[PDB]
């Protein structure tokens, strides 16, 4: 509802009630591991490969992103969230009249260099910054000398000053004087005087003074950050205002990988390397690190680690989030070429419905040209990236893996045992001339097959997405709406429209639209419905029978 | 009925009787606070933001109003009531014979400057006022001198007098006198000579005397306020009738901020400042201000203060007016960032059905780029502005707040505890990809959950509005009128109409119209009915069931 | 209805009545900015480029206007409104017994030169006005000496005089005397001699008199402004009535840049420059300027300032007008080459549906040929001039900009983030043989897709124009009319006509005739209507499935 005009009117008029009501999940994937770049305990959004490669410099995580976006040829590249577990810290140094610190966290940041060798021809400090790892070697100049002022009056001498607040060194005035008497002054507080443009215009208006912006950087710096001048003579010189600090803020805020801070006057200093870059140490538990993905919209998450304690932690994490209204599922892999007994031990230890285990490990072809021999959990990453590429309520059963080879080629009996015990395994298809690798099943670690919801990943996915979407939509729409007689009818219409839309997308098989019984009483709304869940075929029986046909003529 | 004519006529005629029957609610939010303007102890009604700014010059109260009208972007800006706690007084100067007084209340009025001059060409005074804080500067040039008299006769002398009467201390007569006799008298004490224009017209009647209006023109003064003159020669002079008092009242009564009144004799004096401009003491007890309210119709009220004594006094006030047939409610808040244990205390101290406590405090962006970080009761103002924007029997549950940021981000457990202690709380949602702020629930401080009327603001508001309108309309129409034998059916029709009208606007759910009963005996209007109350959803139960379906071909 | 004749007559006749009924939006663009000429706090309509140049001599506001007219080559150059922020004042001087004031406001007025001389060859005064900046130069030679008076008789004495009205010192008479007493006198206050040529002719008609007008310019001064003459001999020479200053006024009242007025005696003076030309300084807040735009007529407005205070002031202003009944929308640009963080912080500061942000800044090939490198808000002007060329309901999405170059050329990921966060951005289309630049979207600062009316400029513009036009027409047509039986049908027919005209102009998609319903009750009229919104294509899904085909012979 949107009545127009918003102000009530009592005299004769016309009124209009504009109404826009009614006219108006991606199943995100997550990764955690290590990298040579990006800040710690900070989650990011990954859309392009170039963006991630610029942020995440290198390591196993970048390979895991490339495998996830490459593990599904026939699907799109889905959005992925990533973060760094290492407690890295940046390089920082004290030089000149400033304190410098780098933004990249890690041992690589030590190679950063900052200097202010002065080019006396331009009377400015030539800021050269270098980062040899990134091939970043750029030269900046024209720091200071923002603009000129010159005096051409008939008096004997003239002088001008910039008066600061002594306790904070904040510029508050610009005073032009002859001797000790002010020709005119421009208080730099509260008004158009806050910027250098007003000073330039007002000074230009006076016939006795000139003010023109220099081609050494059109900064237009604020007037509060100007330098402190103390009765500098103006008659013979076109005196240059500098404001070196404010010029560093303006010209180097978003240039390079360098920040600046004050403990002072800025002076020249030599080009010096930064120190204190540290990769840090791993955390005792990953549960604090996993908390950053609590509310980021992630559904599938895969830790880049083969340790059982990390797997159990993640399992407790995804359980707690699902119980808190953030459903999630996890896929893990046990290192390199583990035997079946190790896999059964891991499955017994976990025994989580919302966790899956990958048995096979193999080699993959990367864009770098490396035939990277990866552990099982990178295959779990590839599988998560395939699942994300799939829509809601789809299964990854008998989908291709696009692998180059596998360390272990399991026989029929071995694959059957792995599937029975509740571990995901991968087979090599030698039946045809065009051999390929594919996934045999997507069973969870919870091995009780009697209950398909828990056992099947697709069913539990469809259930969690349906429930969470229906819960959010009902919470947003109907709570706080009046308990009018038509409320029950509106609720039943909305439910039917939501279930008919889900059936259109094939996220659910079918539902009886007649059995949607809504009951309303006071603040409570009691709703009952039936849904047939979308399932995936996994066994076909053919009772072929042969018969005899008699032909006549 | 009203016959035409009302008085009977006995002769043969036609008599007409005409019946004009059958052919022919607002919600207001109150505010109390401090500001740089406005009278003390005065209930001011506001409709326009410009009106509030002009009256309330600046301060917290104007910001509160702006927040209240800015907290409902969709809904109409309803009338709001404001009041100043400060016992301010206006500036005045006892300079010369004139008691200069200013309209504005406070210390700002002291800046006013008032002075007088005189122009000898037209023999008329001048007056000036300088209030440059409001960009105000006016000069009343050539005060007085409404019209001229000149002589054109043959007598040997030509004078006019304006007689001053000691009994009335005013100008009583204006007479043209020559020698020792009156040429023609114009008695100002009565008749059409109460205005000057009668005198101007009648002077022209004489062959020997004529009159004309002044070139300045529009003064149009009462003859009783003319100045005292005795036989001023007009033989060959166009002497102006000065009339200084009347033109002093006209140029300064509604013009500007400054009024004038004589204490003494009128004389010019130079420019001088005003004195006595006092903001005034903030009284400890707010009951001195709450009691000043009346039958305006206000419902909601927020005090702009964190004090317990203020909140208790407001609670006692609203309860008293409710018991006195003027239902009201309040919303309060406590300073900045109070912990839960303090908020529990405040709710236990209040425990009022007609008071609500706000937990959160935060920041709001205003028109003039003001990132105003505000105490909790300003949020309570914002809530009361939302509530006024919402129509009768609606609630503020799950609605947006449009707040910029919040101090306390409460988790689900914290909100649950706050709701269980009857404290309204505001939440920042992380479930949706696009995050936003919104209100949790409209729970009151009173904590008997079996009573939804008192527990819930919306139900209590709807019940009070229904009862108040019903009782008013019944008292107006039927109750207390002369007794007749056929009033029960008409009362029951009126009641049913009223119920139908309530049901039409969704103020009630339904009503069993067949169960309405009316009994009359003497002057006892016995009514009994039933109503199904309005309610707003707060809990949704979805019982989902999964089943398997078989398909044949 | 227009009756004929307008005066009824009771006698037998024929009366004719005539009704001329049935015989018979612009979306104006607004600008505020800097200029070197024009009055302060004054709005001017501008369609002709010569008018805009003359009004605004030069600055950034003239360049903005020229860009707007030239930002849409394939559209009509329509009306634009413009205001000058600078509080300039004009140059003035007092010399020669005359008050001199210039029509140009600012420092440019100081170059004006004015001087007065006398011509010995005709006994007449001379004037010269020069403004070297416009190369303006004109000489009003032989000022005064309006007409001669000659006498031809043989009497000893022949004199004429010009007398004045005492109360005003204006020329009231022109007396001719021969011997000792008058021959004829030309009364000037009232009669047949209001003009001096009538005096010239009648003097010519007299037997012993002659008179002729000075040919230098068609003076034809009215006789009120003639100089005083007393007993000036006629028989000596054909004496001139000079009246130098009145003739000067009549010659230069509406010509040239300079105006003149009396100081008192007037005498010549040397050719000298003027004084007092000043531009002043801009105010802190531009909101006081916007009041003049309250009832001018316009939809789009763009201030020429990158400061956030101006933007917040305009945002507030357009919100106030929208709540009043005259909605507007504001387009702004984020300074020079600002990074994504600054754009985000500006978007988060505005967060208004009726405000749109522009990110890209670049160069435009001006008509002068200069490679004018300009800030973002000049691009926002260009977009505002394209939106004003666009018809109602259209969108600036994918429309060509005709820009020369851009400072920042973005990646696909950067463009997507700029779109998603409610910032208008531009891409450099490189794949074509004809490379160019196109607008990607017209999304507003308000960043929620739930309401396309608030989130899209075109939809919101169509809704606002529709509501305003319907409100105006309904209020003009049916308020104050009679509540006749066919009132509801007439209203329905007028709405259908109006919606069918909208649908014809493609301002709406469609509407259902059945939903249009008119309810009459008392002094009110409730109307229910439906319209399908017009929309712009912003997403095209295509599905291409190949199939086999078999050919027989």
Beta bridge mates, B332: B357
Query: Where would I find the beta strands (DSSP E) of A271-386?
Result: 272-273, 298-303, 329-333, 355-358, 362-365, 371-373
Contact A477, A490 (CB under 8 A): no
d(CA C259, CA C251): 11
Entry resolution (Å): 4.0
Contacts of C278 in chain A (CB under 8 A): 205
User: Out of B76, B536, B545, whose CB is closest to A481?
Assistant: B536
The token pair that represents A468 in the structure block: 């969470």
User: Out of A51, A205, A218, whose CB is closest to C413?
Assistant: A51
CB count, 10 Å around CB of B57? Answer: 18
The token pair that represents B311 in the structure block: 């909140």
- Location of structure tokens 């003639």: C226
Q: Which positions in chain C have a beta carbon within 8 angstroms of at least one beta carbon in chain A? A: 107, 278-279, 281-284, 307, 322-325, 336, 339, 341, 411-413, 416, 449-453, 463, 467, 470-471, 474-475, 479-480, 533
Burial of A407 (0-12, 13-18, 19+ CB in 10 A): middle
Q: Which residue of A has its CA nearest to B543?
A: A528
Which chains reach chain C with 3 or more Cβ–Cβ distances below 8 angstroms? A, B
The token pair that represents B308 in the structure block: 């317990």
CB contact under 8 A, A5 and C325: yes
CB contact under 8 A, B23 and C349: no
What DSSP line would sit under C501-536, residue for residue?
HHHHTTSSSB--GGG-EEEEETTEEEEE---BPP--
Q: Which residue of C has its CA nearest to B433?
A: C448
Contact A297, A28 (CB under 8 A): yes
d(CA A128, CA A255): 11
Q: What is the dihedral of CA C255, C258, C262, C268, to 10 degrees?
A: -100
The token pair that represents C287 in the structure block: 């909101």
Q: How many residues does chain C have?
A: 553
d(CA A178, CA A155): 7
The helices-and-strands tally (H runs, E runs) of chain A is: 12, 30
Give the Å distances, CA to CA, from B51 to B45, C97, C272: 10, 48, 51
The H or E element containing residue A342 is helix A340-350
d(CA A302, CA A377): 8
CB count, 10 Å around CB of B48? Answer: 13
Contacts of B134 in chain C (CB under 8 A): none
3-state SS, residue B10: coil
Q: Is the peptide bond before C66 cis (omega within 30 degrees of 0)?
A: no
User: Which of C166, C288, C307, C323 is best to mutate for the B interface (most B CBs within 10 A)?
Assistant: C323
CB contact under 8 A, B535 and A524: no
CB contact under 8 A, C312 and B49: no
Q: Which residue of A has its CA nearest to C323?
A: A6
3-state SS, residue A269: coil
CB contact under 8 A, B367 and C312: yes
User: Out of B49, B77, B369, whose CB is closest to C312?
Assistant: B369
d(CA C18, CA C313): 52
Pairing of strands B100-105, B90-93: antiparallel
Contact A423, A359 (CB under 8 A): yes
How far is the first Cα of chain B from the last one, in angstroms, to the nearest whole number? 81
What DSSP line would sit under A54-100, residue for residue?
HHS-SSHHHHHHHHHHHS-TTS----EEEEE-S--BEEEEEETTEEE
The token pair that represents B462 in the structure block: 């709807």
CB count, 10 Å around CB of B60? Answer: 20
| Nearest alpha-carbon partner for C80 in C319, C316, C297, C330 | C297
Q: Which residue of C has its CA nearest to A200?
A: C281
Which chains reach chain A with 3 or more Cβ–Cβ distances below 8 angstroms? B, C
Contacts of A474 in chain B (CB under 8 A): 540, 542
d(CA B374, CA B368): 16
Contact A73, A390 (CB under 8 A): no
The helices-and-strands tally (H runs, E runs) of chain B is: 12, 28
Burial of B17 (0-12, 13-18, 19+ CB in 10 A): exposed
In angstroms, the separation between the Cα of residue C319 and the nearest Cα of chain B is 10
User: Out of B24, B365, B434, whose CB is closest to C448?
Assistant: B434
CB contact under 8 A, C309 and B23: no
The token pair that represents A141 in the structure block: 């100049």
Beta bridge mates, C174: C162, C186
- Give how far the C-alpha of residue A286 lies from the chain's centroid of Cα atoms, to the nearest Å: 19
Pairing of strands B329-333, B300-303: parallel
Q: For A401, phi and psi rounded to 5 degrees?
A: -100, -20
Instruction: Please count the CA atoms within 13 angstroms of the CA of B482 that sit on its side-chain side.
Output: 1
Q: Which residue of B has its CA nearest to A293?
A: B430
The token pair that represents A208 in the structure block: 């006795």
Which chains reach chain B with 3 or more Cβ–Cβ distances below 8 angstroms? A, C
Q: Residues of B377-389 as b/e, b for ≥16 C-beta within 10 angstroms? A: bbbbbbbbbbbbb
Q: Is the peptide bond before C5 cis (omega within 30 degrees of 0)?
A: yes
CB count, 10 Å around CB of B168? Answer: 11
- Location of structure tokens 């820009």: C403
| Nearest alpha-carbon partner for C38 in C135, C131, C110, C109 | C109
Contacts of B23 in chain C (CB under 8 A): 522
In angstroms, the separation between the Cα of residue C283 and the nearest Cα of chain A is 7
User: Out of B79, B537, B543, whose CB is closest to A479?
Assistant: B537
User: Which of B20, B240, B369 is best to mutate for the C interface (most C CBs within 10 A)?
Assistant: B369
Contact B90, B277 (CB under 8 A): yes
3-state SS, residue C149: strand
Contacts of B535 in chain A (CB under 8 A): 482-483, 522-523
């Amino acid at each position: 509802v949107e009545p127009f005009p918003r102000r009530p009117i009592t005299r004769p008029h016309a009124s209009i009630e504009v109404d826009t009501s009614g006219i108006g999940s991606e199943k995100v994937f997550c990764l955690i591991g290590q990298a040579e770049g990006g800040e710690p305990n900070t989650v990011y959004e990954l859309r392009n490969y170039s963006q991630a490669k610029r942020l995440f410099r290198s390591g196993e995580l970048l390979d895991a992103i490339e495998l996830a976006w490459g593990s599904n040829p026939n699907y799109t590249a889905g959005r992925i969230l990533a973060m760094r577990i290492e407690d890295a810290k940046p390089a920082s140094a004290e030089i000149g009249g400033l304190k410098i610190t780098s933004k990249i966290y890690g041992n690589v940041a030590n190679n950063i260099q900052v200097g202010l060798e002065k080019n006396t021809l331009s009377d400015s400090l030539r800021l050269r910054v270098i980062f040899q790892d990134d091939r970043f070697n750029e030269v900046y100049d024209n720091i200071g000398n923002i603009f000129t002022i010159k005096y051409k009056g008939e008096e004997a001498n003239a002088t001008f000053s910039v008066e600061h607040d002594e306790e904070t060194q904040k510029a508050s005035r610009l005073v032009l004087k002859v001797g000790d008497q002010e020709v005119k002054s421009y208080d730099l507080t509260g008004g158009a005087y806050d910027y250098t443009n007003a000073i330039i215009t007002d000074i230009n208006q006076l016939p006795d003074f000139e003010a023109k912006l220099s081609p050494f950087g059109d900064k237009n710096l604020e007037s509060s950050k100007l330098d402190k001048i103390e009765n500098a003579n103006i008659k013979d010189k076109a005196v240059y205002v500098k404001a070196v600090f404010g010029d560093l803020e303006k010209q180097t805020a978003y240039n390079g990988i360098v920040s600046f801070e004050q403990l002072k006057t800025i002076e020249p200093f030599e080009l010096t390397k930064l120190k204190g870059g540290t990769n840090g140490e791993p955390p005792a538990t990953w549960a604090d690190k996993l908390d950053k993905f609590a509310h980021e919209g992630g559904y599938y998450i895969v830790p880049l680690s083969s340790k059982q304690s990390v797997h159990a932690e993640v399992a407790s994490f995804v359980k707690e989030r699902s119980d808190a209204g953030e459903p999630m599922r996890a896929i893990v892999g046990g290192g390199f070429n583990e035997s079946k007994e190790q896999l059964f031990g891991r499955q017994a230890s976990l025994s989580n419905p919302r966790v899956s285990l990958v048995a096979n490990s193999g080699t993959f072809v990367m864009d770098d040209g490396r035939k990277n021999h990866v552990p099982a959990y990178m295959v779990a990453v590839a599988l998560g990236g395939l699942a994300s590429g799939l829509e809601i309520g789809e299964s990854i059963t008998f989908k291709p893996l696009r692998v180059s080879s596998l360390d272990q080629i399991y026989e029929s009996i071995d694959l059957d045992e792995l599937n029975e015990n509740g571990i995901i395994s991968i087979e090599f298809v030698r039946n045809r001339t065009n051999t390929f690798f594919r996934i045999v099943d997507d069973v969870t670690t919870f091995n009780d097959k009697s209950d398909p919801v828990k056992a099947e990943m697709a069913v539990g996915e469809a259930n969690d997405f349906l429930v969470s979407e229906l819960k959010v939509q009902l919470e947003d729409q109907f709570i706080g709406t009046r308990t009018i007689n038509t409320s029950a009818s509106i609720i039943k219409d909305f439910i039917q429209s939501y279930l008919g839309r889900k059936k259109r997308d094939n996220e659910i098989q079918d539902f009886p639209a007649e059995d949607v019984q809504v009951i309303v009483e006071g603040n409570e709304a009691r709703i009952s419905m039936t849904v047939y869940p979308i399932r995936s075929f996994k066994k076909i029986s053919v009772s072929l029978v042969y018969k005899q046909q008699t032909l006549q003529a």
